[PDB]
Design a protein around this ligand. Structure first.
Ligand code: HEM
Ligand code: HEM
Ligand SMILES: [Cl-]
Lengths: 414, 414
C-alpha cells in the first residue's frame, strides 16, 4: 500500500468516474505502487469478491495482455466493474462472446473472425463511409447548433458496422436501436431499456442473416465467416449471432467516444485543430484514441498463482489493466499531457496491449475516426462548444452522453 | 366461414380471454366449421401474418399432434398469440428450447431428456413432495384466510422442479423468482419485470450446475442427462441450460393453474369435493387437468401444403390446436360440462395430443396435483371461496392470478 491512496478508494467506482477519471491518483500509483490492490470489503458488484489488482504502468499492461495463458478473460469477463445489483450469473455468461473467451474456443473463433477484418474487407467500405461522413457532417452543419454526440459522433460507428455486415438499409434503425439498448449500463438516462431482450433480438436477426447468406452469398464479410475453409472451419449460425452481438457492443460507443473526446481535445487545443484542418496528418487518429482512451480499463483473472512486477497475485484474483493510466505513462510517452496530433511513435494501448484479444476492429476504428474528422474539417471548420460535455456514469467506459456545440462558430442559424 | 362467428373475432385475443374463455364460440365452430380461419388483417402480434387456422375437434387436434412431419413447431413456436409489440426476432428464437424445436434436433434432445422423466426418477421425489405439500397446506390453514394462488397453488410446482434437479435449498428463492419473471407475458401486474435477463441468469446458473455435477455426480437427473450413453449421447452444458429454461416455463404456471382451477371446480361442485375427500380417487388429477386445460391452445405451422379435415392449408400458415375446445368435444366426452372426478376413460388433451411434443412432465404434474389435493383435503377440508378468481390477461394460458379463500370455512382465524 502507499500513503497517498488509501486501499478503499475504488478507481472503477461509477459515481467517482461520472465526476472525473482518477488521473492524479493513477499517476501516484505509477510513481509509488504500480501494481496496487483495491479493497472492496463488502463485495464487488457482479463478481462478489473483495477487491482487485490495478495495473497502472504501460509495460505491465502489455505484460498482462501478452500472457493470456495465466491471465484469462473467461472466469470474470473483461469488463472490470459492475453495479451492486449485477448478478454473478450475468457475469459468468459474458463468456458467450469473443472478448470474454479463453483458448481453445477463443482461438478458433478469433481466427475465423479475422477473415472479416482484413485491409481489403475494411478498405472496401471506405467510399461509402466517406460519403456518409460528409452527409452526417453537412446535415449537422445545417442545424447551426446542437448535440455534437447525437448529431456528429453517433452515426458513423454504427454505419461502419452496418456496411461491414451488409445490413439492408431498412433494417438499420432497429439494428442501431438494439446496439444502443445493449449498452444501457448504469446511467439513469438509460434505466428504462432492456439490454438482454435487445441482445436476444439481435442474435435472432443475425442468425436469420446467416441462414439467408448461406443460400444467397454476398460481397460482405458474412459470407466469408460462414463458408467452411480447407479444414471445414467457419462460424456456425449461432456463432455468427454471438459475433454480431460482439460487434454491436465493441464498435459503437467506443468509436463514438473517441470522436467526441477528439473534438473536445481540438476545442481545448485550437492550434492542433488549425494544424489538423491544414494537414489532415495520418498520425491524428492514434493520438485521438490515446487521448480519448474510450475503454478506461479491462481486466483478466489469474488462472494460477503468478508473480507480476514483483507482486504475488493469487489464482482467481482479478487483475485490472488501466489503459487510461498506461496511455499517460511518463516512461513511455514524451509529454503525455500534450495533445499532439503528430505524436510519433505513439505506442498507445487504447486498442489493448498486443495479445490474444487485441482489438480486431482497430483499423476500422481509425478509418471511422479519419473519415468523420475530415468531414468535420470540410463542412464545419469553425465549430465551437456552447456547453460542458456531460459525462456517462460508468466506471470503465470513458463516455460522453451529450455536448452542445455551435457548428457555425458565430451563433449562426447555418 | 359460418354465420354465427365472424372471421375477425380473434379467439386468442388476450383482452377477450382476460374476461372469459370463448367457450360458446368454440362450441359453434365444432358444430359448424371445425377447422376455421381467423382474419387478423392488420398483422398478428409477433408473427406478422394475417391470421391462423383454429382446430376445434378432438380428433383433428390429435391428427395435427401426430403429424409433426408436416405440422412443425420451429417456424413460429408453439405459443399461438403474442402482443402487438412482440418482435418477429423474439418469436424466431423461441426455437432455442425443446417445445419449439423440430427434427432432427428435437428428436435427439427429447430422447436424452426423457432420462429425467422415468417413473423411477419421478417416484423418487414423492416422499419429499408429500412432506412439502402437507407443510404448504398447514402453513396456509394457519392463516385462516388468504390468496389461495400464492399460498396453496404456487409453491409445489416450483419445488417439484427444484427437487427434480437437486437445486440447493439456498438457491431456490432466486430460481423460483427467475421462473416467475420469465413468464411475465402481457398482464399489467407484471409489466415491470425482465423476462430475458431472468432467462439469461437461469441459463447461466444451470450451466454452472452442469459443470459442477460433471465433477461431483448425484442421485438427481442432472447427472443422467449429462453422462454420455453407449453412443456418446448427452446434453452439452448449454443444452442442459436451455433444458432448465424449458422446465421453468413448462412446469410452473401450468401445474399452478391446474391446482387453482381444480379447487375452483371443487368449490362450485361441493359433492365432488365430498367424494374427493372421502375416496381420494386416482382419476381425479386427470379430470382436474381436463377441466383446467391450463394451456388453452398451442399451434404448429404447415411445412408444406396439406389437407386437414377436408380443408386445404397452405405451407407457412399457422394451425392452432384448441385444447380448450377439444377437451369439451361432445363426440368424445360424455357430458363434458360435468366435473366428474371419476371420469373414465378420460382421453383429454391438456397434456397435448400423443406425438413428438406430448408433455414430458405429465406424470410429474399428476403427482403434484395428487399431492397437493391430498394435503388440502387433509389440512383444510372445509375451505370456501371469499372472492372471485381473478383471471390472468393471456390469450393462450388459462391463468388465475389471485383467489381469496377462507381456509377454515367459518370466518375463523385458524
Ligand atoms: C476507438 C474505438 C475502439 C476502441 C478504443 C477499442 C478498444 C478495444 C479493446 C481495449 C479491446 C480489448 C483488448 C484486449 O483485451 O487486449 C477490444 C477488443 C475487440 N474489439 Fe475493439 N475497440 C474499438 C473499436 C472496435 C471496432 C470498430 C470494432 C469492430 C466493429 C471492434 C471489435 C472488437 C472485437 C471483436 C474485440 C474482441 C477481440 C478478441 O477478444 O479477440 N473494436 N477493443
Ligand atoms: C398440469 C400441468 C401441465 C400441462 C397442462 C402441460 C401441458 C403441456 C403441453 C400442452 C405441452 C405441448 C404438447 C404438444 O405440443 O403436443 C407440453 C410440453 C412439455 N411439457 Fe408440459 N404440461 C404440464 C406440466 C409440465 C411439467 C410439470 C413439466 C416438467 C417439469 C413439463 C415439461 C414439459 C416439457 C419439457 C414439454 C416439451 C416436450 C417436447 O416438446 O418434446 N410439463 N406440456
Ligand atoms: Cl437472453
Amino acid at each position: 500500500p502507499t500513503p497517498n491512496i488509501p486501499s478503499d478508494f475504488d478507481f472503477l467506482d461509477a459515481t467517482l468516474n461520472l465526476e472525473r477519471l482518477p488521473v492524479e491518483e493513477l499517476a501516484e500509483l505509477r510513481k509509488s505502487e504500480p501494481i496496487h490492490w483495491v479493497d472492496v470489503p463488502g463485495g464487488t458488484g457482479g463478481f462478489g469478491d473483495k477487491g482487485y489488482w490495478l495495473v497502472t504502468k504501460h509495460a505491465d499492461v502489455k505484460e498482462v495482455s501478452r500472457r493470456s495463458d495465466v491471465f484469462g478473460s473467461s472466469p470474470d469477463g473483461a469488463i472490470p466493474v459492475w453495479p451492486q445489483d449485477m448478478t454473478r450469473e450475468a457475469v459468468d455468461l459474458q463468456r458467450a462472446v469473443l472478448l470474454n473467451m479463453d483458448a481453445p474456443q477463443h482461438t478458433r473463433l478469433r481466427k475465423i473472425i479475422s477473415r472479416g477484418f482484413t485491409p481489403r474487407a475494411i478498405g472496401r467500405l471506405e467510399d461509402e463511409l466517406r460519403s456518409r461522413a460528409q452527409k452526417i457532417a453537412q446535415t449537422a452543419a445545417a442545424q447551426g447548433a446542437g448535440d455534437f454526440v447525437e448529431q456528429v459522433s453517433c452515426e458513423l460507428p454504427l454505419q461502419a458496422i452496418a456496411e461491414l455486415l451488409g445490413v439492408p438499409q431498412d433494417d438499420r434503425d432497429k439494428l442501431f436501436r438494439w446496439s444502443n439498448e445493449m449498452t444501457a449500463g448504469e446511467d439513469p438516462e438509460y434505466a428504462d431499456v432492456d439490454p438482454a431482450m435487445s441482445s436476444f433480438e439481435l442474435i435472432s436477426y443475425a442468425m436469420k442473416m446467416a441462414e439467408e447468406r448461406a443460400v444467397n452469398p454476398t460481397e460482405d464479410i458474412v459470407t466469408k465467416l460462414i463458408e467452411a475453409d480447407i479444414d471445414g472451419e467457419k462460424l456456425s449460425d449461432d456463432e455468427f449471432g454471438f459475433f454480431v452481438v460482439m460487434l454491436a457492443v465493441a464498435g459503437n460507443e467506443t468509436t463514438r467516444n473517441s470522436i467526441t473526446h477528439g473534438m473536445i481535445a481540438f476545442a481545448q487545443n485550437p492550434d492542433q485543430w488549425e494544424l489538423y484542418k491544414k494537414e489532415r496528418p495520418e498520425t491524428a487518429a492514434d493520438e485521438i484514441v490515446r487521448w480519448a482512451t474510450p475503454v478506461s480499463a479491462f481486466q483478466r483473472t489469474a488462472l494460477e498463482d503468478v508473480e507480476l512486477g514483483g507482486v504475488q497475485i493469487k489464482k482467481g484474483q482479478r487483475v485490472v489493466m488501466s489503459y487510461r493510466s498506461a496511455n499517460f505513462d511518463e516512461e513511455v510517452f514524451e509529454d503525455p499531457h500534450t495533445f499532439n496530433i503528430l505524436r510519433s511513435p505513439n505506442p498507445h494501448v487504447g486498442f489493448g496491449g498486443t495479445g490474444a484479444h487485441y482489438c480486431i476492429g482497430a483499423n476500422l476504428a481509425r478509418m471511422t475516426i479519419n473519415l468523420i474528422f475530415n468531414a468535420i474539417a470540410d463542412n464545419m471548420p469553425d465549430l465551437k462548444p456552447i456547453g460542458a460535455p456531460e459525462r456517462l456514469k460508468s466506471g470503465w467506459l470513458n463516455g460522453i452522453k451529450h455536448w452542445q456545440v455551435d457548428y457555425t462558430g458565430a451563433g449562426k442559424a447555418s
